[PDB]
Amino acid sequence: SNLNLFYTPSEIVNGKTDTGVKPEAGQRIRVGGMVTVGSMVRDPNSLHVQFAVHDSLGGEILVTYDDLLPDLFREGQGIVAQGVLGEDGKLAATEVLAKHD
């Protein structure tokens, strides 16, 4: 089966996907961290959407999404996104759970 585990965005930059050392494009993981106010950008297409997400670790990872996000993905909260690493540096995620409450 495909595993499922939650990891910090800032972690999964430095010496991880970006640098392709430990993880690799192919594995499914969940990024979990805080979205910055100006992070969310949608296409005029209105199906393609991408967002930067970060943590106190002071690294920002870009996540890409290829349908309409739930609640348009409201900014300035902390969500979890499940995705597979595919874009040797970016992660393709469609299962975002905004359990911020």
Q: Report the candidate in 77, 87, 84 with the shortest Cα–Cα distance to residue 40.
A: 77
CA separation for the pair 65, 47 (Å, rounded): 8
Helix (H) or strand (E) holding 65: strand 60-65
Q: How far apart are CA 23 and CA 29, in angstroms?
A: 10
Structural fold of domain 1-101: OB fold (Dihydrolipoamide Acetyltransferase, E2P) (2.40.50)
Is residue 48 a known part of a binding site? no
Instruction: Rounding to the nearest 10 degrees, give the CA dihedral for residues 10, 15, 16, 21.
Output: 180
Cα 56 from Cα 59, distance rounded (Å) = 8
Cα 68 from Cα 65, distance rounded (Å): 8
